[PDB]
């Protein structure tokens, strides 16, 4: 799987923004596909996941209710709308591909190379 990050900048706390994910590969509906963020000196952390074939979005706490994943399927695009910004939501924001291995965790074999966002 091959993915690519856009949309970052530089936005006013309070605000919105909208990144997006476009991905592409052999089977790619197969895979899980995630959010990923790493603020400056701090650890990556999982922000949300969808898998193709479900409505259901799985969010990290630090996020659920303000950042929404969403899909278009003719473009193969994953999104992240992000709402309601906080400072503490400056970040390198990544997506990523792994299997949709059921009955195990997702491992995430594929990524992006970022698109970075800072919140004042």
């Known amino acids: 799987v091959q993915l690519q990050e856009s949309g970052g900048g530089l936005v006013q706390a309070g605000g919105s923004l909208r990144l997006s994910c476009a991905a592409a590969?052999?089977?790619?509906?197969?895979?899980?596909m995630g959010w990923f963020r790493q603020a400056p000196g701090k650890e990556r952390e999982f922000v949300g996941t969808?898998?193709?074939?479900?409505?259901?979005?799985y969010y990290a706490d630090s996020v659920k209710g303000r950042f929404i994943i969403s899909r278009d399927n003719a473009k193969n695009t994953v999104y992240l709308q992000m709402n309601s910004l906080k400072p503490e939501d400056t970040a390198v924001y990544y997506c990523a591909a792994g299997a949709g291995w059921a009955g195990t965790m997702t491992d995430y074999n594929y990524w992006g190379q970022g698109t970075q966002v800072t919140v004042s």
């Open positions: 590969g052999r089977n790619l509906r197969m895979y899980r």
């Open positions: 969808m898998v193709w074939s479900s409505d259901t979005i």
